[PDB]
Amino acid sequence: ESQCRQNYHQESEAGINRQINMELYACYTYQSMAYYFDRDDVALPGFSKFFKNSSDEEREHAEKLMKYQNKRGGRVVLQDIKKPDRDEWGTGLDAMQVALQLEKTVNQSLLDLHKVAKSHQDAQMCDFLETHYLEEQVNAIKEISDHITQLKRVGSGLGEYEYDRRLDS
Amino acid sequence: ESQCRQNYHQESEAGINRQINMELYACYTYQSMAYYFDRDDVALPGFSKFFKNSSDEEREHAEKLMKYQNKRGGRVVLQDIKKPDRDEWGTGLDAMQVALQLEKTVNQSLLDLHKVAKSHQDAQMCDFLETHYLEEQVNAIKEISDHITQLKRVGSGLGEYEYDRRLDS
Amino acid sequence: ESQCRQNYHQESEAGINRQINMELYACYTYQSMAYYFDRDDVALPGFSKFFKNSSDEEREHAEKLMKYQNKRGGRVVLQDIKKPDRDEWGTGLDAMQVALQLEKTVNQSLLDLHKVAKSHQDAQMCDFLETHYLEEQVNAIKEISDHITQLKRVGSGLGEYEYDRRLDS
Amino acid sequence: ESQCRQNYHQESEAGINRQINMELYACYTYQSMAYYFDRDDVALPGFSKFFKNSSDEEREHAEKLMKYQNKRGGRVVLQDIKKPDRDEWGTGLDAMQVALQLEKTVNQSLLDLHKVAKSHQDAQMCDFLETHYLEEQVNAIKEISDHITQLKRVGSGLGEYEYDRRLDS
Ligand SMILES: [Fe+3]
Ligand SMILES: [Fe+3]
Ligand SMILES: [Fe+3]
Ligand SMILES: [Fe+3]
Questions:
Q1: Contact B145 C43 (CB under 8 A)
Q2: CA-only gyration radius of chain A, Å
Q3: I want to staple A43 with a disulfide (CB 3.0 to 4.6 A). Which of A67, A115, C87, D149 is the partner?
């Protein structure tokens, strides 16, 4: 047993490893959308940049969990990173609806994992997830929702071009 | 009864006073290690400086609890500060193992006291301890653990000299 | 058929996707080594930083291939990313030997893919791989080889500690 | 026989003169599109600026071949520059489709000429074309292709006006 370990349950630890894989899956999907919108027959560089940055943030989320695992005395165990669901992602509106459901999926995995820690009375881990994970998801979901509403307002064609310019700046 | 007092249980208050004394005990032990490594027959100024700073942080921890006690309407009641366990602390590796067990002791006293506050539904006090106490202990324990692992890697003699240079910068 | 496509053979295209997956696999193994050395019972932060940066570079390599794929009119197709071979990586010297064999694996794949492009007379793709991929692998293999030679010179114990300081500074 | 000449085949030399004329023809067509969009009944100053710059780049490409010709010991021989194919170029989307087919024509000629040099084992000339000509054509074709995709997204009318602002800014 690790010399750090104090108040850190086996179940919390494996949840972290589960969530790490979840973040990496999010990162992989976002990265696929990014280069999907870089395609010459899509050509939406603002959407492309928005998802590339979303990707880099999910990967940052994952490494902080890895860092946390070590801080508490857990051990990182990595699984395969499953490829994204689709190879093509449709219109800009389509990919953002996928993004919303993705972020909500991640939020649920995080809310479940907060439950494990509260159950085991892991107060520090609860605050860790409150401060560094749950608040980001709430902002991320609201922001993507706003995007969805705007993409429906402007419609297709010129409207989708104009919103892409908005993500590009 | 204090005009501040709201949602602050008698048991939470006396736990604070208990923890204050615990922090001061930590400060006193660290201060003893600091000047132990300042001895001419020990002469490890980097270890000396590491523990002197650890001491100053524990004392800062204690005064913030005193400040908190007053914020909530409690009353600070101070007890004797028991002298440290040992007068001499052995090698640099030895004193860090003592430090780890010390920090873990403090972490347990804090985790227990978080339980009192959660039990009394003292949400504000839980966040106070999450934000300002529990996260520091997790970082402090991990950092001391790393030190222990390194002190075993470099061994005694020149290796302990080299690590002391690392704490001195 | 993409309006971009000119002189871009379907076999070259599928190799890019192949190499993309290989780079991502390299990235994943380095990420694993990085947080392996961040463990409290390993505690080699220099080695940890070296592999975290190596990780970030492989992902950079992968995104430039995705970018290239789109430039030539190909289409990115992502596969799973297989978990790294090991969960623990031993000593600093051990993980570097793995890194050399990893880099050589990546170099071999890149060399094979340069063959596919020269066969199809894809001159631009050859220079792309020459300029942005083959030169880095040669430098990377040599640098890791130097690291291996040095880690054997200093031996274990204090010597592995000293080299970790060299990777950190 | 030039005192420079080494490993420079007469067929490579005559191809350079061939390509010089091709670059100048590209330059001339872009110059025509530029002032086509400066017409008061077209009035697309962004498109006009984009093609004026494209014009200036092709002439730059041509002068570097003349410069190269002299470096290797060849001799520049200039032919007529044929008027552009059209006098009017239609919509912004139309002229970009012409531009893509133009760039691909130039790319094809450059690829053929790279073949002539590799056959004659003119390694330096291959890298010259790889470094200074083939990479730019790949980027140019992709950028124009992106433009084509966007001009179809925004449609005509306001959409063509908005994209013109994007090329102007
Ligand atoms: Fe995330
Ligand atoms: Fe403390
Ligand atoms: Fe690589
Ligand atoms: Fe040109």
A1: yes
A2: 18
A3: D149
Longest CA–CA separation in chain D, Å: 60
3-class SS of residue A28: helix
Q: Which of A43, A158, A165 sits opposite D149 (nearest CB)?
A: A43
Q: Of how many residues is chain A composed?
A: 169
Q: What residues in A contact D149, CB-CB < 8 Å?
A: 40-43
* Token digits of residue D138: 């790949």
DSSP secondary structure string for all residues of D69-103: HHHHT--------PPPS-S---SHHHHHHHHHHHH
Asked if A40's CB is within 8 angstroms of D145's CB, the reply is yes
* Residue C60 CA: distances (Å) to CA of C23, C54, C80, C100, C104: 9, 10, 18, 19, 18
- Say what the resolution is, in angstroms: 2.5
H/E stretch holding C51 = helix C45-72
**Residue D66, Cβ neighbours under 10 Å: how many?**
16
Cα A33 to Cα C78: distance, rounded to the nearest angstrom: 11
Structure tokens at B30: 């660290």
Tokens of A138: 């709430």
Residue B111 structure tokens: 């985790």
DSSP label at C156?
S
Contacts of B117 (CB under 8 A, 6+ apart): B12, B15, B125, B126, B129
How far is Cα D160 from Cα D168, in angstroms, rounded to an integer? 12
Ligand 2 center–CA B110 separation, angstroms: 9
Quote the CA–CA distance of A30 and A92 in Å, as a whole number. 13
User: Is position D13 annotated in a ligand binding site?
Assistant: no
**Interatomic CA distance for residues D94 and D85, integer angstroms:** 13
C99-103 contact pairs (CB < 8 A, 24+): C99/C30, C99/C33, C99/C51, C99/C54, C99/C144, C100/C141, C100/C144, C100/C145, C100/C148, C102/C26, C102/C29, C102/C30, C103/C26, C103/C137, C103/C140, C103/C141, C103/C144
User: Using an 8 Å Cβ cutoff, are B92 and B163 in contact?
Assistant: yes
Query: What is the distance between the alpha carbons of residues D45 and D38, in angstroms, rounded to a whole number?
Result: 6
> At residue D3, what is the residue type?
Q
The closest alpha carbon to B140, from B45, B53, B38, belongs to: B53
Show the tokens assigned to D95: 């002229």
- Window 10-49 of A, Cβ < 8 Å to D: 40-43, 45
Tokens of D148: 């084509």
Half-sphere exposure of A62 (CA within 13 A, CB side): 26
Domains belonging to chain A, first-starting first, are 10-168 (1.20.1260.10)
Query: For the residues of A38-71, what is the DSSP string, one character each?
Result: TSTTT--HHHHHHHHHHHHHHHHHHHHHHHHHHH
Look at C157 and B155 and tell me if their CB atoms are within 8 Å.
Answer: yes
Distance CA D58, CA A139 (A): 48
Ligand nearest to the CA of B140: 2
b vs e for A62-79, b when ≥16 Cβ sit within 10 Å of the residue's Cβ?
bbebbebbbbbbbbbbbe
Q: Measure CB to CB from residue A70 to each of C28, C35, C84 and give the nearest one.
A: C35
d(CA B104, CA B107): 5
Tokens of C164: 């970790």
Q: Which residue of A has its CA nearest to D154?
A: A158
Q: Which chains touch C (3 or more CB pairs under 8 A)?
A: A, B, D
- Interval between CA C67 and ligand 3 midpoint (Å): 15
Smallest Cα distance from A5 to chain B, Å: 9
Q: CA-CA distance, D117 to C43, in Å (whole number)?
A: 56
A29 in Cβ contact with A105 (< 8 Å): no
Experimental method: X-ray
Structure tokens given for A164: 């892409």
Residues 6+ apart with CB under 8 A from B76: B17, B20, B66, B69, B70
Read off φ and ψ for residue C79, nearest 5 degrees.
Answer: -105, 175
What does each C-alpha distance from B142 to A81, A151, B112 come to in angstroms? Answer: 29, 47, 20
- For C34, the token pair is 């990085």
